């Protein structure tokens, strides 16, 4: 299986530096082009740079030339993006992709992407509050409950239920930026009313940028 | 540089329908155009390359065509899992460039929301803030009006909404509205109400609680 | 400024799709007519009715 895995994305101050890596497996980067492509609200999908590891030839987008460099270590089957003199406009998901693989002249495999956030604001871990099921969250014999993941920075967070065993009926809402400059979201799940009190429901929240990992048990509140 | 212009920006169609989206290059790009799909939470995935060739594993209901500098992507029989954004890309000249995307949505029958409300947790109340959450579950279409009232006074400027992308199983939406107050403000008032207006409801629905009631 | 032209696409077999075009009123207009002409190749001759000062269109195809 062909795979590309980006790493290294994180919060960085304006003017700061960051280095991304792109670990390839299931093919040899000496046989293809490797690209960095980013995606942002401001500019959508935007090509950043490419390299042909066999001969080391590189090309750059005008907006990053001089500030970013692409390179590749074929002995580790890995490509890199050095990012200096960073600006708000560089805030984006950074993907790496291959081109020319198996003779296909298009970007046919893309990694999961790594988020780069350029901001002077500081890291803050979320508070996780239960959304307890109640007489006001049930109808038709099913009940809603959830977790409020409030006041964190930067993105990303992840939310799962019962360690990923519970996926049916889950709605995890898009993160919203509060006026405070901190993010917040809720995740809810609908379950049988009869299961409340017998089945354990736990939301697993992880905010890697602050090393915050919380598993919050959500139950009906005692009256 | 070469500009790729995609139309329409949004297209909504029923399951089984034939849909067509377009992409125009600002100058000759030969056949060097690819189409990518991006599903919710996902990375771009290659569908079509060199204008008209299907990438391995892509359903044959996808097809692509070129006419001069005009490119088309056709889905012959729209499926629920085709709900996604679609992007074209030229690789004829450096820099490779992408279109702005076309969002493709699924049409389905009207469904009224299930409406629920959650007081602030006692846990949160230990601190200085209170979040009240109104939940609208599994409705269609997306348009919905949610208003907050506190002791029957309409609230403004102190709530935020968030809406999920279309559900993979039933093509519906869900929405959260969160009212944020200080703990002091929360403890000063009694009745918290969210009123929901939606096409599937015969008249607006109000879900409320009295602070302190179990 | 930027506007959104909303289009109903009404096909000969009664099927209905909806689309939006954005840009200046002039750009979005041109794009909508361009798209109509393209769909006409496969779906038959189109007619476009403009409501809301041109900001909404009903586009029917002959089949």
């Amino acid at each position: 299986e062909v795979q590309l895995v980006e790493s290294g994305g994180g919060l960085v101050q304006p003017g700061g530096s960051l280095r991304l890596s792109c670990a390839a497996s299931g093919f040899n980067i000496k046989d293809t082009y490797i690209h960095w492509v980013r995606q942002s609200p401001g500019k959508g999908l935007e090509w950043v740079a490419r390299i042909y590891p066999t001969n080391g030839y590189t090309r750059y987008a005008d907006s990053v030339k001089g500030r970013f460099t692409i390179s590749a270590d074929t002995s580790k089957n890995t490509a890199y993006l050095q990012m200096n003199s960073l600006r708000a406009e560089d805030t984006a998901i950074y993907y790496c992709s291959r081109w020319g693989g198996d003779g296909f002249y298009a970007m046919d495999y893309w990694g999961q992407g790594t988020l780069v956030t350029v901001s002077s604001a500081s890291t803050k871990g979320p508070s996780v509050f239960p959304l307890a099921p109640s007489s006001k969250s049930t109808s038709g014999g099913t009940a809603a409950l959830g977790c409020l993941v409030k006041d964190y920075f930067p993105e990303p967070v992840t939310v799962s239920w019962n360690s990923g065993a519970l996926t049916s009926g889950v709605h995890t809402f898009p993160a919203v930026l509060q006026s405070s400059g901190l993010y917040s979201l809720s995740s809810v799940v609908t379950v049988p009313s009869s299961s409340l009190g017998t089945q354990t429901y736990i939301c697993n929240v992880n905010h890697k940028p602050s090393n915050t990992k919380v598993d919050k048990k959500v139950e009906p509140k005692s009256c | 540089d070469i500009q790729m212009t995609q139309s329409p920006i949004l297209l909504s169609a029923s399951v089984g329908d034939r849909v067509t989206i377009t992409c125009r290059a600002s100058q000759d790009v030969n056949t060097a155009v690819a189409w990518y799909q991006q599903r919710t939470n996902g990375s771009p995935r290659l569908l079509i390359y060199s204008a008209s060739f299907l990438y391995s594993g892509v359903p044959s209901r996808f097809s692509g065509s070129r006419s001069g500098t005009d490119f088309t992507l056709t889905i012959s029989s729209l499926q629920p899992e085709d709900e996604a954004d679609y992007y074209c890309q030229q690789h004829y000249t450096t820099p490779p460039t992408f279109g702005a995307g076309t969002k493709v949505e699924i049409k389905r029958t009207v469904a009224a929301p299930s409406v629920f409300i959650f007081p602030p947790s006692d846990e949160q109340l230990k601190s200085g803030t209170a979040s009240v959450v109104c939940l609208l579950n599994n409705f269609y279409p997306r348009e919905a009006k949610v208003q907050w009232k506190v002791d029957n006074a309409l609230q403004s400027g102190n709530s935020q909404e968030s809406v999920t992308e279309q559900d993979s199983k039933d093509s519906t939406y869900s929405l959260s509205s969160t009212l944020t107050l200080s703990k002091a403000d929360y403890e000063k008032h009694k009745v918290y109400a969210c009123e929901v207006t939606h096409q599937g409801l015969s008249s607006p629905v109000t879900k409320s609680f009295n602070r302190g009631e179990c | 400024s930027e506007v959104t032209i909303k289009v109903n696409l009404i096909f000969a077999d009664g099927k209905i799709q909806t689309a939006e075009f954005k840009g200046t009123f002039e750009e979005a207009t041109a794009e909508a007519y361009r798209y109509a002409a393209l769909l006409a190749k496969v779906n038959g001759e189109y007619t476009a009715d403009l409501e809301d000062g041109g900001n909404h269109m009903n586009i029917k195809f002959a089949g």
């Binding site: 993105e155 979201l185 | 920006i9 949004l10 990375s43 995307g101 992308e165 | 959104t4 939006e20 954005k22």
Partner: peptide, 13 residues
Amino acid sequence: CQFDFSTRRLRCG
């Protein structure tokens, strides 16, 4: 329509 990190989807309107 505008791309949102949280969903990796365009949001219109």
